[PDB]
């Protein structure tokens, strides 16, 4: 399954999202070795990850080694797959000396054009919020397409400061005119960070993106993906 993701070629008949281009996940002169279930594949800035072989609506885990070949960091690489979007994250564990950090990699998919959004109606999205050592968060998000605004909330994470509101924010076009919502994160009604979600799918079926929550210990990343039911 994980091994098939690493070894199999694409399969037009596999459940989308079929592929994900690794960009942020592996920079210009890096190589990213992913391993699971006995298999290994190396990428490849620009390279495609065969997400078609992975289970939808779950986090798939691989061991990773990021290199430039000399090893910089290793830990666990996480991929969350929906039908029209997916994202990746890295749980660094070693750099060898124990040292942990969780950071989002790529947020990818078939972006919904800002110029081709639904003209009205209210959509509710339900999915997962995942952060360090915790893929059990629940994301609820609502978009009003008449107002072109979205809002939502993250619940059920073990770390109390990550259970935040995703405050109302406008949908805007990004540099490619993809529809994105960038807004404020609230903790006990007060701002403590920022979030960004892209809208994905021809009919805006999905959202995916991340939140960054400021703590006294640094910024914590939460990966976000939800879909209309």
């Amino acid at each position, epitope marked *: 399954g994980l091994a098939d993701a690493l070894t199999a070629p694409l399969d037009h008949k596999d459940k989308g999202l079929q592929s994900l281009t690794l960009d942020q996940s592996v*920079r210009k002169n890096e190589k990213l070795k992913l391993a699971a279930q006995g298999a290994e594949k190396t990428y490849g800035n620009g390279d495609s990850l065969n997400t078609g072989k992975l289970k939808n609506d779950k986090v798939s885990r691989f061991d990773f080694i990021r290199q430039i070949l000399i090893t*910089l960091e290793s830990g666990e690489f996480q991929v969350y797959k929906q039908s029209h979007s997916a994202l990746t994250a890295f749980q660094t564990e070693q750099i060898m000396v124990a040292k942990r*950090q969780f*950071r989002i990699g790529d947020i990818a998919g078939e972006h919904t054009s800002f110029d081709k959004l639904p003209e009205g109606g209210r959509a509710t999205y339900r999915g997962t919020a995942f952060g360090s050592d915790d893929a059990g968060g629940k994301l609820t998000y609502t978009i009003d397409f008449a107002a072109k605004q979205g809002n939502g909330k993250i619940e059920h994470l073990k770390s109390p400061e990550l259970n935040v509101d995703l405050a109302a924010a406008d949908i805007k076009p990004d540099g490619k005119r993809h529809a994105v919502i960038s807004g*404020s*994160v609230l903790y006990n009604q*007060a*701002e*403590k*960070g*920022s979030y960004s979600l892209g809208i994905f799918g021809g009919k805006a079926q999905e959202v995916a993106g991340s939140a*960054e929550v*400021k*703590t*006294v*210990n*640094g*910024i914590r990343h939460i990966g976000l993906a939800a879909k209309q039911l």
Partner: antibody, heavy 119, light 108 residues
Framework: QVQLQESGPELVKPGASVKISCKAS????????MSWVKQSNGKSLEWIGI????????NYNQKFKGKATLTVDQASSTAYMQLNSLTSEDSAVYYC????????????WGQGTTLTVSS | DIVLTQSPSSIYASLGERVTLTCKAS??????LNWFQQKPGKSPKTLIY???RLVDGVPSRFSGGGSGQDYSLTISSLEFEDIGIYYC?????????FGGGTRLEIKR
């Protein structure tokens, strides 16, 4: 009237302790973190530590643990930094700095407090 | 701790010239970078956060860029009030750490 107004310059002997204040006005003090920064010789800058005034959580740069203690008084909207066991290496200008943007920690700065430790 | 380095350490430029300052981190800092400007005897002033976001009210002649380890601050057209020392800082991994500064001075 300026948002972060620090206490005046201090001149003390080695071995002494000082407590520097940073009085907040014009914004919601409890809703924003306050950090402290050391600038030595008008050049090199270092981050000392940060405190969340609402929740009381603190993080110290390891290098300053046992040198600096951060506290706040929410009722008077004042942040404090106490520096203990002073030596000449503690002579510097100290700044309080609050955050303002959701993805930044260091957005508006106090006017600075000069500390001189000398015998 | 992450190490931040700034080059060059001094820049001389004429009024109206384009100036670019550089900053490099010892590891990927995920765009969590500030730029501060400091005049003599004054406190630092934040100009950029998150590597490329302009602080409210900062003149549009300033802009931040970069990713991974390599960042820059560019002033499109140097003005006299821009003279001072510029520092970068990363806040991706605590403790936040500052670069050593680049002084911007006037050619004559």
């Amino acid at each position: 009237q300026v948002q972060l107004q620090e206490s005046g310059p201090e001149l003390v002997k080695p071995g002494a302790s000082v407590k520097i204040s940073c009085k907040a006005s014009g914004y919601s003090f409890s809703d924003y973190n306050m950090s402290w920064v050391k600038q030595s010789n008008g050049k090199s800058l270092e981050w000392i530590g940060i405190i969340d005034p609402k929740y009381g959580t603190i993080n110290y740069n390891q290098k300053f643990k046992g040198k600096a203690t951060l506290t706040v008084d929410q009722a008077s909207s004042t942040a404090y930094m106490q520096l203990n066991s002073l030596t000449s290496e503690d002579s510097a200008v100290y700044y309080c700095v609050r955050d303002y943007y959701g993805s930044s920690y260091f957005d508006y700065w106090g006017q600075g407090t000069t500390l001189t430790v000398s015998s | 701790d992450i190490v931040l380095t700034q080059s060059p350490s001094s820049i001389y430029a004429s009024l109206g010239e384009r100036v670019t300052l550089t900053c490099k981190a010892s590891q990927d800092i995920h765009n969590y970078l500030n730029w501060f400007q400091q005049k003599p005897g004054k406190s630092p002033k934040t100009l950029i956060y998150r590597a490329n976001r302009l602080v409210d009210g900062v003149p549009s002649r300033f802009s931040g860029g970069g990713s991974g380890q390599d960042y820059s601050l560019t002033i499109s057209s140097l003005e006299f009030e821009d003279i001072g020392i510029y520092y970068c800082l990363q806040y991706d991994e605590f403790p936040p750490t500052f670069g050593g500064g680049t002084r911007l001075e006037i050619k004559r």
